[PDB]
Amino acid sequence: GWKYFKGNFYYFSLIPKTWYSAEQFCVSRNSHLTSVTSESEQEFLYKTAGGLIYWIGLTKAGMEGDWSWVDDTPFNKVQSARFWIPGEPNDAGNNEHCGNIKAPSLQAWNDAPCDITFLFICKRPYVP
Numbered sequence: 001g002w003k004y005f006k007g008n009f010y011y012f013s014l015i016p017k018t019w020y021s022a023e024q025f026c027v028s029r030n031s032h033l034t035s036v037t038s039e040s041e042q043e044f045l046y047k048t049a050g051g052l053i054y055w056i057g058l059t060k061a062g063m064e065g066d067w068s069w070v071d072d073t074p075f076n077k078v079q080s081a082r083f084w085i086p087g088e089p090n091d092a093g094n095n096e097h098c099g100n101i102k103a104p105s106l107q108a109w110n111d112a113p114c115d116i117t118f119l120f121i122c123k124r125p126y127v128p
């Protein structure tokens with residue numbers, strides 16, 4: 001049940017997993033938890049999510065706790081600012097080092113604890 005959008009296939013899971021178990025599942029299917037690199041991709045993702053919470057490829061990297069994409073897409077702090085829910089990321093309990101799609105809006109992302117289980121979204125490139 002992979003959905004096709006702009007050169008990539010996407011898997012919206014039916015089973016919830018911790019952030020890392022999710023990523024491992026994605027990697028087992030030749031994919032990664034999804035990156036988000038445009039307004040149109042964000043829109044495709046939150047709309048397809050239909051108001052449910054899905055882990056995406058957001059996770060912390062380096063000593064500074066900068067956000068990064070697990071698929072190694074460079075994280076663009078400037079261009080991604082409009083994608084977080086107002087007030088996020090907020091590192092609640094100093095233990096929110098992974099990110100999910102939460103609100104059905106362009107401002108969709110929340111940081112949550114990595115060990116919480118949620119549905120998840122894998123992204124796999126199509127290579128002709």
Ligand SMILES: CO[C@H]1O[C@H](CO)[C@@H](O)[C@H](O)[C@H]1NC(C)=O
Pocket residue numbers: 088090092096110111112113116
């Ligand atoms: C009450 O905390 C929840 O909502 C806040 C924003 O109010 C979020 O910042 C926070 O991450 C989220 N917690 C979880 C576990 O998802």
Ligand SMILES: [Ca+2]
Pocket residue numbers: 088089090091092096110111112
């Ligand atoms: Ca948060």
